[PDB]
Amino acid sequence: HMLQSTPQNLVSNAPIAETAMGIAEPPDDDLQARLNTLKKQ
Protein backbone atom coordinates (compact mmCIF):
# COMPACT_ATOMS: atom_id res chain seq x y z
CA HIS A 1 0.00 0.00 0.00
CA MET A 2 1.01 3.61 -0.60
CA LEU A 3 0.13 4.76 2.94
CA GLN A 4 0.29 3.31 6.50
CA SER A 5 -1.02 4.69 9.80
CA THR A 6 1.83 6.00 11.91
CA PRO A 7 2.69 3.29 14.46
CA GLN A 8 1.41 3.90 17.99
CA ASN A 9 4.97 3.63 19.42
CA LEU A 10 5.89 6.73 17.35
CA VAL A 11 2.66 8.74 17.85
CA SER A 12 2.71 8.80 21.65
CA ASN A 13 5.78 10.97 22.18
CA ALA A 14 5.35 13.12 19.01
CA PRO A 15 6.36 16.73 19.63
CA ILE A 16 3.99 19.65 19.57
CA ALA A 17 5.52 22.90 18.07
CA GLU A 18 5.16 24.58 21.46
CA THR A 19 8.00 22.50 22.96
CA ALA A 20 10.76 24.49 21.17
CA MET A 21 9.17 27.92 21.43
CA GLY A 22 9.97 30.66 23.90
CA ILE A 23 13.24 29.13 25.07
CA ALA A 24 15.77 31.64 23.79
CA GLU A 25 15.40 35.00 22.09
CA PRO A 26 17.06 34.67 18.59
CA PRO A 27 25.65 15.59 34.70
CA ASP A 28 26.52 16.53 31.09
CA ASP A 29 28.64 13.35 30.81
CA ASP A 30 25.90 10.78 30.19
CA LEU A 31 24.24 13.26 27.79
CA GLN A 32 27.41 13.52 25.62
CA ALA A 33 27.66 9.69 25.89
CA ARG A 34 24.15 9.24 24.48
CA LEU A 35 24.76 11.83 21.73
CA ASN A 36 27.95 9.99 20.78
CA THR A 37 25.91 6.78 20.46
CA LEU A 38 23.04 8.51 18.52
CA LYS A 39 25.13 9.93 15.65
CA LYS A 40 26.78 6.62 14.57
CA GLN A 41 25.93 5.25 11.07
Binding site: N13, A14, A17, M21, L31, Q32, R34, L35, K39
Partner: protein, 82 residues
Amino acid sequence: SHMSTGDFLTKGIELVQKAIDLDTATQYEEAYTAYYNGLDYLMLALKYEKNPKSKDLIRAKFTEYLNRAEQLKKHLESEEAN
Protein backbone atom coordinates in the same frame (compact mmCIF):
# COMPACT_ATOMS: atom_id res chain seq x y z
CA SER B 1 41.67 31.31 13.63
CA HIS B 2 37.84 31.62 13.66
CA MET B 3 35.99 33.68 16.23
CA SER B 4 32.93 31.93 17.60
CA THR B 5 30.49 34.84 17.32
CA GLY B 6 27.11 33.04 16.85
CA ASP B 7 24.64 31.77 19.44
CA PHE B 8 24.85 27.96 19.61
CA LEU B 9 21.69 27.81 21.71
CA THR B 10 19.46 29.58 19.18
CA LYS B 11 21.11 27.68 16.29
CA GLY B 12 20.33 24.39 18.11
CA ILE B 13 16.71 25.53 18.66
CA GLU B 14 16.37 26.53 14.99
CA LEU B 15 17.40 23.01 13.91
CA VAL B 16 15.18 21.30 16.48
CA GLN B 17 12.16 23.40 15.34
CA LYS B 18 12.80 22.10 11.79
CA ALA B 19 13.08 18.52 13.16
CA ILE B 20 9.74 18.93 14.91
CA ASP B 21 8.05 20.10 11.68
CA LEU B 22 9.49 17.07 9.82
CA ASP B 23 8.62 14.70 12.71
CA THR B 24 4.99 15.97 12.62
CA ALA B 25 4.93 15.39 8.83
CA THR B 26 6.07 11.75 9.49
CA GLN B 27 9.29 12.54 7.55
CA TYR B 28 11.30 10.51 10.08
CA GLU B 29 14.52 10.09 8.09
CA GLU B 30 14.90 13.87 7.66
CA ALA B 31 13.62 14.55 11.23
CA TYR B 32 16.24 12.24 12.73
CA THR B 33 19.05 14.11 10.90
CA ALA B 34 17.61 17.51 11.91
CA TYR B 35 17.38 16.40 15.59
CA TYR B 36 20.98 15.24 15.71
CA ASN B 37 22.20 18.42 13.98
CA GLY B 38 20.27 20.48 16.60
CA LEU B 39 21.61 18.38 19.47
CA ASP B 40 25.28 18.93 18.42
CA TYR B 41 24.70 22.69 18.75
CA LEU B 42 22.78 22.35 22.06
CA MET B 43 25.57 20.15 23.47
CA LEU B 44 28.09 22.92 22.74
CA ALA B 45 25.70 25.54 24.20
CA LEU B 46 25.50 23.34 27.35
CA LYS B 47 29.31 22.77 27.55
CA TYR B 48 30.00 26.49 27.36
CA GLU B 49 27.04 27.87 29.41
CA LYS B 50 27.95 29.65 32.66
CA ASN B 51 24.42 30.42 34.11
CA PRO B 52 23.23 27.38 36.16
CA LYS B 53 19.51 28.09 35.55
CA SER B 54 20.22 28.28 31.83
CA LYS B 55 22.21 25.03 32.03
CA ASP B 56 19.25 23.42 33.85
CA LEU B 57 16.81 24.43 31.12
CA ILE B 58 19.18 23.45 28.28
CA ARG B 59 19.68 20.06 29.97
CA ALA B 60 15.91 19.45 30.28
CA LYS B 61 15.32 20.30 26.60
CA PHE B 62 18.39 18.37 25.36
CA THR B 63 17.09 15.26 27.16
CA GLU B 64 13.59 15.61 25.62
CA TYR B 65 14.94 15.95 22.05
CA LEU B 66 17.52 13.25 22.61
CA ASN B 67 14.79 10.85 23.85
CA ARG B 68 12.84 11.53 20.66
CA ALA B 69 15.81 11.24 18.31
CA GLU B 70 16.65 7.83 19.88
CA GLN B 71 13.09 6.62 19.17
CA LEU B 72 13.36 7.68 15.54
CA LYS B 73 16.72 5.98 15.14
CA LYS B 74 15.32 2.63 16.43
CA HIS B 75 12.42 3.00 14.02
CA LEU B 76 14.80 3.61 11.09
CA GLU B 77 17.00 0.61 12.12
CA SER B 78 13.79 -1.47 12.11
CA GLU B 79 12.71 -0.29 8.59
CA GLU B 80 16.28 -0.88 7.35
CA ALA B 81 16.42 -4.48 8.62
CA ASN B 82 12.93 -5.02 7.23
